[PDB]
Amino acid sequence: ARIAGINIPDHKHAVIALTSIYGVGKTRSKAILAAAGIAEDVKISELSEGQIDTLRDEVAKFVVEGDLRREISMSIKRLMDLGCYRGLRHRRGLPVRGQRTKTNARTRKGPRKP
Amino acid sequence: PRSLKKGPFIDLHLLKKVEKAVESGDKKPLRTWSRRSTIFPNMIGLTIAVHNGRQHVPVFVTDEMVGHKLGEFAPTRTYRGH
Amino acid sequence: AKLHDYYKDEVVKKLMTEFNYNSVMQVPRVEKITLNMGVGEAIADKKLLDNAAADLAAISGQKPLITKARKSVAGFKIRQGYPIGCKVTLRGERMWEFFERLITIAVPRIRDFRGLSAKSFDGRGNYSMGVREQIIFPEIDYDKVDRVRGLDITITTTAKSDEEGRALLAAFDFPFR
Amino acid sequence: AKQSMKAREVKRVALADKYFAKRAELKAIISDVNAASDEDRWNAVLKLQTLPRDSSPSRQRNRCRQTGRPHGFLRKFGLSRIKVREAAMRGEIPGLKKASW
Amino acid sequence: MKKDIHPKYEEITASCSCGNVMKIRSTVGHDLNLDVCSKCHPFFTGKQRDVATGGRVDRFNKRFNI
RNA sequence: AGGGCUACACACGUGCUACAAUGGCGCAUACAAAGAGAAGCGACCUCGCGAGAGCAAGCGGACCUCAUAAAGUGCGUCGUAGUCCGGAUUGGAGUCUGCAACUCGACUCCAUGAAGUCGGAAUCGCUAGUAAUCGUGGAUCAGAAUGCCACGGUGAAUACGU
Ligand SMILES: [Mg+2]
Ligand SMILES: [Mg+2]
Ligand SMILES: [Mg+2]
Ligand SMILES: [Mg+2]
Ligand SMILES: [Mg+2]
Ligand SMILES: [Mg+2]
Ligand SMILES: [Mg+2]
Ligand SMILES: [Mg+2]
Ligand SMILES: [Mg+2]
Ligand SMILES: [Mg+2]
Ligand SMILES: [Zn+2]
């Protein structure tokens, strides 16, 4: 339970545990476990060292937590330093893809100020 | 976005202006209205003035602005605050 | 060491020819590179000074000295002797190593890089730059950095004049827009 | 509708019909993979641009044939909602009765 | 120099996209795989005489129709 | 021609989605009604994880297509946790319509995985195939619905009384 540099949980099935990797959801998790050949309903606790090692290799073949953070943050910074419309929206902390901001922009603006 | 089978989009007048500028032009910013035209690597190093509704904002092309149309870098709604 | 040897042979001989000197030691040698970060927000975020010191340690393999306020300034709300910055001085092999690292790795990574400002001499042949983004330096992790803060660098040189300093740096293959 | 919306739509219809079967073949050229995409498709895109915009059927608003109202149109009667109701209750629309089920 | 206050300043190999590989004593913790270096930068050798392996080709040249 | 009606320190109305286990997910299996179609619906076959793409018949329609109904039933799992609840935001990669999808379309894949733990003053609908929920169709429509108008599936509780 030390895949990709995190401490993926015990007592959870393989899919649910590998969901905890920042960059692996349900689909990528099941793809990794299928490539590794293990049944999907078995806990991480009862996975042997070699099986965990091939899981680590496949996760490394995919993108990992800190790496994914690095590219997503550089893409955001790329938008900002281009100063496109999306760069302006990211800088301002307003919705970027064209939602209404007269109302319903709270998840992007934070709670109401006054 | 625009599909791959159709290729990117660019206004033909913009193509002619950019081609003329790169082959025999270092004079003046290219006054363009096509906010819908994708940026190609031909217009690198140009300083084109793109319309945003009332005036032409200058935008200087850089190595990374690739899959962006000219309107991405021209604001249309001035807003200071409240 | 590599660019040190390149200096000692090629730059020494070509500058000798360029300046028509009588002695070898008359060629501009280099004393040091001083890297400063005038943090100036430690008052708000005291831990920002620690972050900057660790950051400078990452660029150059030296624990920085905490530069303290020379005297109290009411305009900037600083007192006398308050730790308002960090510095590292590199001279010798570590100087040369940071020098190759900078010139060959960090400089081309500058965002929209159009060369360096070709007029940044004090007046007797010592050069200086200010880099806006620390991220240009490969030693940065970009994940354990709270703020994208810049720094400034000063190559202090034995050059007799601005032209001698510029010639030395050009022999060292600087951009010089 | 000012007579000018009406004239505009009339010329849009005329221009779209007079360029029809050219825009269609250009769309086919852009769509079909079997046709060369290097230069032929590119020139097709450029020509499709150089064709006047009003020739596109997408610029049809389907105004009312009588009052040129843009909103409330119905294709079956070719009339706005209110003119449909007026003509219906007068009896000029065949087979139309106030439904109730 | 002083002991047990400086960071680790081990040797690393820095390889970039153009095939330039250089050995440098630095403080990173592992080998470096960068992209742009002295030789493979436009301004260094020819402002309009360089080729890239990034945005000008990757996102575009695999998709363009010209 | 472009921009704006899509601007956002804020308030309000009307809705959709949730806060979960009467449920989330995977597999198998059932049962509708009512509509629309020719510069349109578009089988089958092949391809793509998918949006969808190529070829391509039938149909002016009790004949062909849209069109795999969904809730449900059984099988397993999840185990009361902000979780396999939530899918809001955000990056990358795309499909289609259209001259063009950046301002400013909808969907598809991956990843990101917010508030929300049943909601104060107050306040709305409904007396039965009604409320509640489940899905399907239509007009508008090149593309663009949680809206509007229709259609069926399950299917209540209560009405002492003024
Ligand atoms: Mg994950
Ligand atoms: Mg609005
Ligand atoms: Mg229309
Ligand atoms: Mg009219
Ligand atoms: Mg107009
Ligand atoms: Mg939902
Ligand atoms: Mg019929
Ligand atoms: Mg949460
Ligand atoms: Mg979560
Ligand atoms: Mg009643
Ligand atoms: Zn290189």
Cβ neighbors of D88 (< 8 A, separation 6 or more) are D96
Calculate the CA A17 to chain-centre distance: 13
What phi and psi, each to the nearest 5 degrees, are found at residue C90? -115, 125
Cα distance between residue B5 and residue D44, in whole Å: 13
Residue E22's SS3 state is strand
Token look-up 């998790």 returns: A29
CB–CB of C167/C134 below 8 Å? no
Interior angle at CA D86, CA D80 and CA D92, nearest 5: 100
Nearest nt to the CA of D73 via C1' is: F140
Please report how the helices B12-24 and D40-50 are oriented relative to each other, as an axis angle in degrees rounded to 10: 110
Cα distance between residue C91 and residue A92, in whole Å: 44
Nearest CA in chain E to D38: E66
With residues binned 3-state (H G I as helix, E B as strand, rest as coil), the percentages for chain E, rounded to 5, are 5, 20, 75
C138 falls within a domain: yes
Residue C153's SS3 state is strand
Cβ neighbors of B71 (< 8 A, separation 6 or more) are A85, B35, B36, B50, B52
Ligand 11: centre distance to CA E35 (Å): 7
What phi and psi, each to the nearest 5 degrees, are found at residue D65? -60, -25
Chains D and B, touching by 3 or more CB pairs within 8 angstroms: yes
Cβ neighbors of E8 (< 8 A, separation 6 or more) are C61, E27, E29
Helix or strand holding residue E27 (H, E): none
Extended strands (E) in C58-150: 65-68, 83-90, 127-131
With residues binned 3-state (H G I as helix, E B as strand, rest as coil), the percentages for chain D, rounded to 5, are 50, 5, 45
Q: Which residues of B touch D30 (CB under 8 A)?
A: 5-6
Encoding tokens for residue A10? Answer: 């015990």
**How many domains are there within chain C?**
1
CA of D39 to C1' of F142 (A): 26
Nearest to E64 among B8, B45, B63 (CB): B8
Check C57 against E7: CB less than 8 A apart: yes
Q: Residue count of chain A, please give it.
A: 114
C27: left (phi over 0), alpha (psi -120 to 50) or beta: beta
CA of C165 to C1' of F143 (A): 65
Token look-up 């795989």 returns: E33
The edge-to-edge listing of strands for the beta sheet with B56-58 is: B31-32, B49-51, B56-58
Which of B 1-40 lie inside 8 A of D, CB atoms?
5-7, 9, 11-12, 15
**Of C155, A4, C54, nearest to E6 (Cα)?**
C54
CB–CB of A61/A54 below 8 Å? no
Token look-up 């991220």 returns: C135
Interior angle at CA D90, CA D84 and CA D95, nearest 5: 70
Q: Which of D49, D50, D53 to mutate to test the interface with B (most CBs of B within 10 A)?
A: D49
CA of A80 to C1' of F9 (A): 24
Check C111 against A81: CB less than 8 A apart: yes
Encoding tokens for residue C11? Answer: 């730059």
Nearest to B66 among E48, E60, E65 (CB): E60
Q: Report the CATH number at residue C25.
A: 3.30.1440.10
Check B15 against D46: CB less than 8 A apart: yes
Range of the domain at E8: 1-41
Name every residue in B having a CB less than 8 A away from some CB of E. Answer: 4, 6-8, 40-41, 45, 63-64, 66-67
Q: Is E16 annotated as a binding residue?
A: yes
Encoding tokens for residue B6? Answer: 């159709």
Nearest nt to the CA of B66 via C1' is: F102
Q: Which of C136, C143, C145, C147 to mutate to test the interface with A (most CBs of A within 10 A)?
A: C143
Encoding tokens for residue C171? Answer: 């022999």
CA of C142 to C1' of F114 (A): 24
Cα distance between residue E1 and residue C60, in whole Å: 14
Nearest to E7 among C61, C101, C113 (CB): C61
Encoding tokens for residue A17? Answer: 């545990």
Query: Measured between alpha carbons, how far is residue B45 from residues A89, B59, C71, C112, C166 in Å?
Result: 26, 10, 47, 11, 28
Please report how the helices A49-61 and A26-36 are oriented relative to each other, as an axis angle in degrees rounded to 10: 130
CB–CB of C60/C98 below 8 Å? yes
Nearest to E56 among B4, B8, B66 (CB): B66
Using what technique was this structure determined?
cryo-EM
Check B67 against E59: CB less than 8 A apart: yes
Token look-up 């000012």 returns: D2
Range of the domain at C12: 3-172
CA of C117 to C1' of F38 (A): 70
Nearest CA in chain E to C172: E38
Residue D43's SS3 state is helix
Question: Mind telling me how many Å the CA of B58 is from chain D's nearest CA?
Answer: 25
Alpha helices in E8-48 (DSSP H): none
With residues binned 3-state (H G I as helix, E B as strand, rest as coil), the percentages for chain A, rounded to 5, are 55, 0, 45
Q: DSSP secondary structure string, A50-88?
A: HHHHHHHHHHHHS--HHHHHHHHHHHHHHHHHHT-HHHH
Interior angle at CA C158, CA C155 and CA C163, nearest 5: 80
Token look-up 């890089």 returns: C113
User: Three-state secondary structure along chain B?
Assistant: CCCCCCCCCCCHHHHHHHHHHHHHCCCCCCEECCCCCECCHHHCCCCCEEECCCCEEECCCCCCCCCCEHHHHCCCCCCCCC
Cα distance between residue C136 and residue C152, in whole Å: 13
